[PDB]
Ligand SMILES: [Zn+2]
């Protein structure tokens with residue numbers, strides 16, 4: 001794949017895509 | 029505020045707006 | 057409802073989340 | 085430009101792209 | 114119609130709004 | 142990676158994440 | 170309502186231009 | 191969970207506040 | 212203005228309620 | 233094809249990677 | 254040359270039509 | 275996460291580390 005800069009609402013979107021139904025934790 | 033109806037990434041986005049930097053856990 | 061930096065399309069997305077069907081005006 | 089089917093946040097985003105700086109009023113009857 | 118700064122995911126979304134089911138090509 | 146249900150602009154955002162600055166062709 | 174139309178049916182970008190400032 | 195409710199029914203932003211850190 | 216509050220500076224959702232109808 | 237599947241059904245990221253440059 | 258057209262420098266929706274297939 | 279993906283750059287793989 002590729003590597004990009006992911007910040008804010010964009011990073012959470014990527015997180016939702018990769019983990020989907022498994023859920024995830026977002027903690028800065 | 030009004031009663032929202034949110035699914036998938038829209039819910040994730042709203043979780044981000046309400047929590048912000050504090051972060052959050054997404055547990056479906 | 058922590059304070060965040062909301063610009064461009066991100067700011068109007070939050071206006072939608074907060075206002076909903078009541079609608080809203082967006083003028084710079 | 086093609087015709088569109090826009091609901092909720094998706095419609096408000098199209099609005100932002102169409103009106104840009106001019107701004108807009110979101111008045112859902 | 115106005116002229117805006119469109120980068121990354123935002124630019125692909127504008128491209129999607131303008132082209133629709135015709136599809137498009139994003140080659141940076 | 143989990144399976145996904147992607148429609149409209151959600152799919153083109155998925156393509157942007159998965160392909161990166163390498164670019165991609167959206168052919169519906 | 171053109172906004173209602175955009176979602177229940179379909180609309181055009183030009184029609185959306187009515188709501189601009 | 192509230193998450194299921196927002197999508198199948200409706201939920202308040204206040205209920206989503208239960209999920210923050 | 213809205214921008215001269217939430218974008219350049221920062222704001223809360225409660226503040227955004229001022230621009231609703 | 234794959235793009236239709238993603239929406240009408242489901243699809244994998246690896247499959248979407250077929251559309252990259 | 255598209256990101257040079259709309260990201261570095263601004264562009265209009267009309268000009269994004271050049272990238273539709 | 276922040277110091278990785280946003281500040282620097284990460285892959286979709288690394289993001290699986292944050293899946294629950
Ligand atoms: Zn959506």
Ligand SMILES: [Zn+2]
Pocket residue numbers: 010066123
């Ligand atoms: Zn953004």
